[PDB]
Design an enzyme around this catalytic site. Structure first.
Site, PDB file in Angstrom:
ATOM      1  N   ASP A 156       0.818  -1.224   0.000  1.00 48.53           N
ATOM      2  CA  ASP A 156       0.000   0.000   0.000  1.00 48.53           C
ATOM      3  C   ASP A 156       0.858   1.284   0.000  1.00 48.53           C
ATOM      4  O   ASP A 156       0.501   2.282   0.638  1.00 48.53           O
ATOM      5  CB  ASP A 156      -0.983   0.007   1.179  1.00 48.53           C
ATOM      6  N   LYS A 158       1.921   4.809  -1.001  1.00 48.70           N
ATOM      7  CA  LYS A 158       1.321   6.013  -1.576  1.00 48.70           C
ATOM      8  C   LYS A 158       1.566   7.170  -0.601  1.00 48.70           C
ATOM      9  O   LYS A 158       1.811   6.927   0.584  1.00 48.70           O
ATOM     10  CB  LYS A 158      -0.189   5.835  -1.826  1.00 48.70           C
ATOM     11  N   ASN A 161       0.087   7.516   3.110  1.00 51.05           N
ATOM     12  CA  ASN A 161       0.509   6.624   4.184  1.00 51.05           C
ATOM     13  C   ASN A 161       1.914   6.927   4.717  1.00 51.05           C
ATOM     14  O   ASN A 161       2.425   6.151   5.537  1.00 51.05           O
ATOM     15  CB  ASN A 161       0.450   5.154   3.720  1.00 51.05           C
ATOM     16  N   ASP A 174      -0.166   2.320   8.230  1.00 54.66           N
ATOM     17  CA  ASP A 174      -1.177   1.509   7.539  1.00 54.66           C
ATOM     18  C   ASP A 174      -0.606   0.202   6.982  1.00 54.66           C
ATOM     19  O   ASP A 174      -0.185   0.130   5.817  1.00 54.66           O
ATOM     20  CB  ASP A 174      -1.887   2.298   6.424  1.00 54.66           C
ATOM     21  N   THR A 191      -4.323   0.473  -4.084  1.00 50.85           N
ATOM     22  CA  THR A 191      -4.909   1.684  -4.631  1.00 50.85           C
ATOM     23  C   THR A 191      -4.670   1.744  -6.139  1.00 50.85           C
ATOM     24  O   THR A 191      -3.530   1.533  -6.581  1.00 50.85           O
ATOM     25  CB  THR A 191      -4.290   2.911  -3.938  1.00 50.85           C
TER      26      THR A 191
HETATM   27  N1  LIG Z   1      -5.511   7.031   4.083  1.00 48.86           N
HETATM   28  C1  LIG Z   1      -4.905   6.693   5.345  1.00 48.86           C
HETATM   29  C2  LIG Z   1      -4.725   7.822   6.051  1.00 48.86           C
HETATM   30  N2  LIG Z   1      -5.167   8.938   5.371  1.00 48.86           N
HETATM   31  C3  LIG Z   1      -4.117   7.846   7.408  1.00 48.86           C
HETATM   32  C4  LIG Z   1      -3.338   6.526   7.653  1.00 48.86           C
HETATM   33  C5  LIG Z   1      -2.798   6.442   9.060  1.00 48.86           C
HETATM   34  N3  LIG Z   1      -2.261   7.517   9.698  1.00 48.86           N
HETATM   35  C6  LIG Z   1      -1.887   7.107  10.939  1.00 48.86           C
HETATM   36  C7  LIG Z   1      -1.220   8.008  11.856  1.00 48.86           C
HETATM   37  C8  LIG Z   1      -0.213   7.500  12.804  1.00 48.86           C
HETATM   38  C9  LIG Z   1       0.443   8.365  13.592  1.00 48.86           C
HETATM   39  N4  LIG Z   1       0.232   9.720  13.545  1.00 48.86           N
HETATM   40  C10 LIG Z   1      -0.696  10.248  12.669  1.00 48.86           C
HETATM   41  C11 LIG Z   1      -1.413   9.469  11.818  1.00 48.86           C
HETATM   42  N5  LIG Z   1      -2.112   5.772  11.163  1.00 48.86           N
HETATM   43  O1  LIG Z   1      -2.764   5.267   9.866  1.00 48.86           O
HETATM   44  N6  LIG Z   1      -4.152   5.338   7.272  1.00 48.86           N
HETATM   45  C12 LIG Z   1      -4.517   5.350   5.841  1.00 48.86           C
END
Ligand SMILES: NC1=C(N)C[C@@H](c2nc(-c3ccncc3)no2)NC1
Length: 340
Positions: A156, A158, A161, A174, A191
């Protein structure tokens, strides 16, 4: 193939396998935290900024609805994500600090990275200069060398992430599609703009799909837009399997040559998947200025530091409707998630 790198990866695999075979479980509960803000939201889960009530520390809490995971057929993928995250350890991977479950939800509590997603910064600036793109790309090359040596595929990559930390370095988040694989695997996931041709054609595929996705990411960082795009996914897929790619005139000749070898439709000819493995990438002319050891040790000054006021600042994330975190009086889907 210096012996110091070989011994490093051998120890890395030893430590991963010990945690893989005996995972941790049930290391906190929901009322140990205060809820602050929704940071992002999806089809079966969301991510929320929280504060631990006893220590005052901030964390990012990923919350998955068990009933929705079952309906969208993501049970095995969710179990992969938590088991891999509690077992890995690398400078550019986000750290999982707690996990637990209750009557309704699954919870993964990570370190909070306050600088925001690479996606936001790329769109605000327009495009990254080649030295700026190369700083980030080098971190992904080392992270994939680590993951692939543990027999893990990521699946994944991109800009959404990739989170930028207080020193300007990447933290990968992610792991919802990550999997341990000895050989080929067959699931359709990812994606659309980043999928390799062999995924689109329903073939058995391997770690070479991560090296294709790195080509898409480097093109997008240096141009400001991805190499294959269109209004409908079917149109994107037609461009990908053709593999015809046009490069902006401001790209250097070295950059074009690297991208032609990462965006190679024939997986048996793709950089990262030949006899010399990752070293065909590390030794390419586009990386001639990169100090691979200094990057790993975090001793290079980053090209860009995000603007934020402290460990609880949310100004680099965007605004979503705030919804309840409800926990049913009755247990749901207990059998399906026994091992979580
Ligand atoms: N499209 C996706 C996102 N847009 C956010 C992402 C994700 N961000 C966080 C995170 C960890 C630590 N601090 C801030 C954010 N953990 O997963 N998952 C997929």
């Amino acid at each position: 193939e210096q012996e110091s790198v070989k011994e490093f990866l051998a120890k890395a695999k030893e430590e991963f396998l010990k945690k893989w075979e005996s995972p941790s479980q049930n290391t906190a509960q929901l009322d140990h935290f205060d809820r602050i803000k929704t940071l992002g939201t999806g089809s079966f889960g969301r991510v929320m900024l929280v504060k631990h009530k006893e220590t005052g520390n901030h964390y990012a809490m990923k919350i998955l609805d068990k009933q929705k995971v079952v309906k969208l057929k993501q049970i095995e993928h969710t179990l992969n994500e938590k088991r891999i995250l509690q077992a890995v350890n690398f400078p550019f991977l986000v750290k999982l600090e707690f996990s637990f479950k209750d009557n309704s939800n699954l919870y993964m509590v990570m370190e909070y990275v306050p600088g925001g997603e690479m996606f936001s910064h790329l769109r605000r600036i327009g495009r990254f200069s080649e030295p700026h793109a190369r700083f980030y790309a080098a971190q992904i090359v080392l992270t994939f060398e680590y993951l692939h040596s543990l027999d893990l595929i990521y699946r994944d990559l991109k800009p959404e992430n990739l989170l930028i930390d207080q020193q300007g370095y990447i933290q990968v988040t992610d792991f919802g599609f990550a999997k341990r694989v000895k050989g080929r695997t067959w699931t359709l996931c990812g994606t659309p703009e980043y999928l390799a041709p062999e995924i689109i054609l329903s073939k058995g595929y391997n770690k070479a799909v991560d090296w294709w996705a790195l080509g898409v990411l480097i093109y997008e960082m240096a141009a400001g837009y991805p190499p294959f795009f269109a209004d409908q996914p079917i149109q994107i897929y037609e461009k990908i399997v053709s593999g015809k790619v046009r490069f902006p005139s401001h790209f250097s000749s070295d950059l074009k040559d690297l991208l032609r070898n990462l965006l190679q439709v024939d997986l048996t000819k793709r950089f990262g998947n030949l006899k010399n493995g990752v070293n065909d990438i590390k030794n390419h002319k586009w990386f001639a200025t990169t100090d691979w050891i200094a990057i790993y040790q975090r001793k290079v000054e980053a090209p860009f530091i995000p603007k934020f006021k402290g460990p609880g600042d949310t100004s680099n994330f965007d605004d979503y409707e705030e919804e309840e975190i409800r926990v049913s009086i009755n247990e749901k889907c207990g059998k399906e998630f026994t091992e979580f």
